[PDB]
Every structure is written in structure tokens, then in C-alpha cells.
Amino acid sequence: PMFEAAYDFPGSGSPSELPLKKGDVIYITREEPSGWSLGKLLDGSKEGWVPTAYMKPH
Amino acid sequence: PMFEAAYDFPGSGSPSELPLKKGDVIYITREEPSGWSLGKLLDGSKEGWVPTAYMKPH
């Protein structure tokens, strides 16, 4: 589904992360019990993991 | 269980949130499917919610 980032997520540098700025809209495809969700900001480019905590309905 | 903060969590100013610095040791008492975990720092005054994504083994 589609979510908007409710917090900034600069990340750590990990290539597995998807850095977010608050307000960014992205498509989440998977949500894992570790507390991470896999998303793609909407052009089809960059995919990676973001905190589920930070995803608000859009 | 006991964890360590894997990332800084400044939060939004919400009274529900427990701001963290990376490396902070926290005891989590609840973990909810929304992606948030409730706990208290080893110091152990204020309890509040943090991203489950940011919890790692200490």
C-alpha cells in the first residue's frame, strides 16, 4: 500500500535502507515483524527498508 | 527484553515517544504490530514508545 513518511529517516548508510524525508510518499510492499517495511519511493527507482513506525496512511 | 538503540530517535515532540541516542540501553515491555515498542532506558525514569526497527541486541 501507499504510505507517507511521518518522520525523517536518514539511515545509517546501509545499502539495504531507503532514506526518507518526512512527507515522502512511498509504496510499501512488505512489512516484517522486525519492525521494518520494504518500500519504493514511486518512480520505480530505489527500493529499501524503512521503519514501519514511520509509515502513516496515505 | 533488553535492547540497544541502533539509530538515533529524536522523535517528534510527542509525549508518548521516548527519544533515544544510538547506543542507549532500553528495556522493552511491549512490542506492537504498528512497528512501535514501549520501554524505559536503563537510567529508567521516563517510559515511552520507540521504533521497533531501531532495537538491536545489546
Short mmCIF file of C-alpha atoms in Angstrom, two decimals:
data_model
loop_
_atom_site.label_atom_id
_atom_site.label_comp_id
_atom_site.label_asym_id
_atom_site.label_seq_id
_atom_site.Cartn_x
_atom_site.Cartn_y
_atom_site.Cartn_z
CA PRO A 1 0.00 0.00 0.00
CA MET A 2 0.91 3.69 -0.09
CA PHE A 3 2.25 5.46 2.95
CA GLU A 4 3.79 8.80 3.76
CA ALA A 5 6.88 9.15 6.00
CA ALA A 6 5.81 10.66 9.31
CA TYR A 7 9.47 11.19 10.44
CA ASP A 8 12.83 11.72 8.74
CA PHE A 9 14.79 8.54 8.33
CA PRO A 10 18.42 9.37 7.40
CA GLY A 11 19.51 5.82 7.94
CA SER A 12 22.98 4.54 8.62
CA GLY A 13 24.46 4.36 5.15
CA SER A 14 23.34 0.76 4.75
CA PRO A 15 22.56 -0.14 1.17
CA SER A 16 19.55 -2.06 2.43
CA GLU A 17 17.87 1.08 3.81
CA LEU A 18 15.70 3.62 1.96
CA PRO A 19 16.46 7.07 3.40
CA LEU A 20 13.29 9.18 3.78
CA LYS A 21 12.41 12.78 4.47
CA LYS A 22 9.20 13.47 6.34
CA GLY A 23 6.34 13.83 3.81
CA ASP A 24 7.89 11.43 1.26
CA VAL A 25 5.26 9.13 -0.22
CA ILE A 26 6.33 5.56 -0.97
CA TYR A 27 4.83 2.24 -1.84
CA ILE A 28 5.29 -0.43 0.80
CA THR A 29 5.36 -4.00 -0.47
CA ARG A 30 6.32 -5.97 2.66
CA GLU A 31 6.08 -5.46 6.39
CA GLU A 32 8.20 -7.66 8.64
CA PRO A 33 7.83 -8.36 12.38
CA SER A 34 11.35 -6.94 12.98
CA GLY A 35 9.71 -3.52 12.63
CA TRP A 36 10.86 -2.82 9.05
CA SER A 37 8.88 -2.33 5.88
CA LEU A 38 10.18 -2.63 2.32
CA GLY A 39 9.33 0.26 0.13
CA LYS A 40 9.92 2.05 -3.12
CA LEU A 41 9.65 5.82 -3.48
CA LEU A 42 7.20 5.99 -6.50
CA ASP A 43 9.28 6.24 -9.78
CA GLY A 44 10.28 2.55 -9.65
CA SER A 45 13.84 3.52 -8.68
CA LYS A 46 15.43 2.86 -5.24
CA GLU A 47 13.92 0.15 -3.05
CA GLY A 48 14.84 -0.48 0.55
CA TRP A 49 13.81 -0.90 4.14
CA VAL A 50 12.28 1.81 6.37
CA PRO A 51 10.91 1.76 9.92
CA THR A 52 7.35 0.59 9.98
CA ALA A 53 6.89 3.00 12.87
CA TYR A 54 7.40 5.89 10.45
CA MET A 55 4.73 4.92 7.94
CA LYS A 56 1.48 6.79 8.09
CA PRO A 57 -1.51 6.07 5.85
CA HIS A 58 -1.64 7.97 2.53
CA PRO B 1 13.59 -7.81 26.65
CA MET B 2 16.72 -5.63 26.89
CA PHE B 3 17.95 -3.96 23.67
CA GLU B 4 20.26 -1.17 22.47
CA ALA B 5 19.24 1.70 20.18
CA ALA B 6 20.69 1.06 16.73
CA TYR B 7 19.90 4.58 15.48
CA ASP B 8 19.21 7.96 16.98
CA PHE B 9 15.49 8.60 17.50
CA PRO B 10 14.86 12.32 18.09
CA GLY B 11 11.15 11.89 17.81
CA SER B 12 8.56 14.50 17.01
CA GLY B 13 7.99 16.03 20.45
CA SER B 14 5.13 13.69 21.22
CA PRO B 15 4.80 12.94 24.92
CA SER B 16 4.34 9.28 24.04
CA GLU B 17 7.74 8.93 22.42
CA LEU B 18 10.97 8.09 24.25
CA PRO B 19 13.77 9.90 22.46
CA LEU B 20 16.93 7.77 22.08
CA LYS B 21 20.54 8.22 21.15
CA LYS B 22 22.30 5.41 19.33
CA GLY B 23 23.79 3.10 21.90
CA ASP B 24 21.23 3.76 24.61
CA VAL B 25 20.21 0.65 26.50
CA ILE B 26 16.48 0.18 26.84
CA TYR B 27 14.15 -2.39 28.39
CA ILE B 28 11.21 -3.06 26.14
CA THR B 29 7.98 -4.33 27.78
CA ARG B 30 5.67 -4.30 24.79
CA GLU B 31 6.02 -4.56 21.04
CA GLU B 32 3.03 -3.75 18.83
CA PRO B 33 2.34 -4.59 15.18
CA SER B 34 2.25 -0.85 14.28
CA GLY B 35 6.04 -1.00 14.44
CA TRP B 36 6.48 0.61 17.89
CA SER B 37 7.90 -0.75 21.15
CA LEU B 38 7.33 0.58 24.64
CA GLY B 39 10.21 0.77 27.03
CA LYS B 40 12.38 2.56 29.50
CA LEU B 41 16.10 3.45 29.46
CA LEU B 42 18.47 1.70 31.90
CA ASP B 43 18.54 5.05 33.70
CA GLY B 44 14.86 4.27 33.98
CA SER B 45 12.74 7.31 34.53
CA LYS B 46 10.53 8.10 31.53
CA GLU B 47 8.82 5.25 29.64
CA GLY B 48 7.68 5.75 26.07
CA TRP B 49 7.50 4.34 22.58
CA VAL B 50 10.33 3.89 20.10
CA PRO B 51 10.61 2.35 16.66
CA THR B 52 10.95 -1.41 16.85
CA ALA B 53 13.18 -1.15 13.77
CA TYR B 54 15.73 0.63 15.98
CA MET B 55 16.03 -2.14 18.55
CA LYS B 56 19.07 -4.45 18.38
CA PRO B 57 20.65 -6.91 20.80
CA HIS B 58 22.97 -5.30 23.32
#
